[PDB]
Structures are given as structure tokens and as C-alpha cells.
Amino acid sequence: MKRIPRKTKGKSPATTEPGTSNREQYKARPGIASVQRATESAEMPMKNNDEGTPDKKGNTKGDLVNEHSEAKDEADEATKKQAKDTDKSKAQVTYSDTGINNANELSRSGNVDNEGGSNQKPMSTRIAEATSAIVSKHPA
Amino acid sequence: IMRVLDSISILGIQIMPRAHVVDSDEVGEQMEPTFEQAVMEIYKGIAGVDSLDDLIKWVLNSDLIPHDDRLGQLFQAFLPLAKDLLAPMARKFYDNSMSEGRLLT
């Protein structure tokens, strides 16, 4: 009974029949090694976009950035990454500064909560203050 | 080639003694950190690469051919060291060699 370790943490007679020799020498085109390297990058899974979702205690994850400006910053990262992948100063393919007018675009951020309010104060902090307003103490 | 040339003597002249020629590596060897192990730290300068081995794997293709873009970056890193360290030592070496005698370099 062989245990499998977990990925993550949770709670707590003659022989040599004829024709078996190796004398064929074939050079594949395209080469095997070239193809495998390309297909390794393709089979990569997609990135986790968990920004704007709650956490273990209920506080929204992510930074406090405006909804509109968050999308524009993410566009600049893609172009910068795209240029690096092609090993160029800039990339021919750009996700930012296109001719299109995407002024109304929105992207997820940690500025807003699930109820639709602002996260100027953490959700956990808001609960503690509200419940403390009703506390009573022992008489003298 | 050096051995074959040194093994020649016609009229008791012994053309091209080994002592009258200098290789291309003495200048590098004179430096206390010699040029080869000096250039083996370009992986420190380059971003995203943590060793000489994976630097080589990154720069070279599966067919042992250098990607032009990667090579150019490596050349960008290499040019300063070849320009500001090797040049003065080479100047000194060629100067005192010329003062000492006529040699093949």
C-alpha cells in the first residue's frame, strides 16, 4: 500500500531475432526537439484572476485602484510583456493605444466589495465597529 | 601549427622557435581574474538567468545555433568588459613585448 504525497496543504536457445538492429539514420523535418519546445509553452494553463474576490475572512482581495484606470494599466503590462517575448524594444502587436476608443471599459479590482460599496475601510473592520456600539458592561 | 613550426630547422637556423611566438591567451592569463572566468559572470548582469548553464541553454538553440536577438543582448553585456579591462593590459603587453624584441603575435 504505497502512499501518494499531497500537492497542497489543507486542514492540519538462441536470441536476437533478425531485424532488431539499429542502423537506420533519419533526420526528421521539422525536428523533434524544436516542436516539443513550442508545444510546452502552448499547453500552459491560464493565469488565475482572483482580484476582487473575498478572502478567508471576507475581505476583498486586491489593491485599491479605480475601475477604469485598472484596465488601462493591465493593457500596458501586456504590451511590455509582448515586447520582451519577441526580444524587441517594442512589440509590433500592442494591446494598448489602439485606434479604438475603449473609454467605458472596466476591469475587476479590490476597490469595490460584493454589496456594491467602497472598500475605503475593510469589511471586517466595519463589522467590528457596528457590533461594538451595542456593548454593555457590568454595573458598579 | 606551433609544434610543426618549431620542429623545423634548415641551415642550422631553426626558423620559428616556440620562444619567439606568443599565443592569444597570455594577455588574458596575466590579469589576476583572467578574462574567461571574468566573462563567466555575465549571468549575474543578465536578467532572468541564474547560472552560466541556463544562460547557455537560453542563448543557444536546440541545433547549437545562437539566436540573433539573445546574442545581441549578450554582446551588449560583453562589449564593456572587452573594452575597458582587456585593452590597457593588452597595450602594456604589446609595448613591453616590442621593447623586448620582435615576435609573432
Side-chain angles (χ1 to χ4, degrees), chain A residues 32-80:
Chain A
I32 297 169
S34 176
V35 175
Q36 323 204 298
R37 293 181 184 271
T39 194
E40 292 295 63
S41 302
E43 66 180 4
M44 295 296 172
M46 293 177 71
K47 163 207 279 193
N48 203 288
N49 188 22
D50 71 322
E51 203 161 11
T53 69
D55 63 358
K56 182 69 175 177
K57 291 174 70 175
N59 303 272
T60 298
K61 293 187 286 185
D63 52 357
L64 283 72
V65 176
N66 189 359
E67 294 293 328
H68 273 112
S69 66
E70 182 65 26
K72 291 174 70 175
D73 301 1
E74 293 179 353
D76 285 293
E77 309 263 349
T79 77
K80 186 180 289 293

Side-chain angles (χ1 to χ4, degrees), chain A residues 33-34 37 85-88, chain B residues 57-58 61-62 69-70 73:
Chain A
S34 176
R37 293 181 184 271
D85 275 357
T86 60
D87 291 331
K88 300 294 187 291
Chain B
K57 294 180 181 180
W58 176 73
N61 199 332
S62 44
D69 45 6
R70 314 219 161 144
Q73 313 160 39

Side-chain angles (χ1 to χ4, degrees), chain A residues 51-55 58-62 109-114 119 123:
Chain A
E51 203 161 11
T53 69
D55 63 358
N59 303 272
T60 298
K61 293 187 286 185
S109 175
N111 189 359
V112 300
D113 72 38
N114 290 291
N119 262 338
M123 188 63 180

Side-chain angles (χ1 to χ4, degrees), chain A residues 9-20:
Chain A
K9 65 179 73 174
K11 291 174 71 175
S12 48
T15 293
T16 67
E17 303 295 333
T20 47

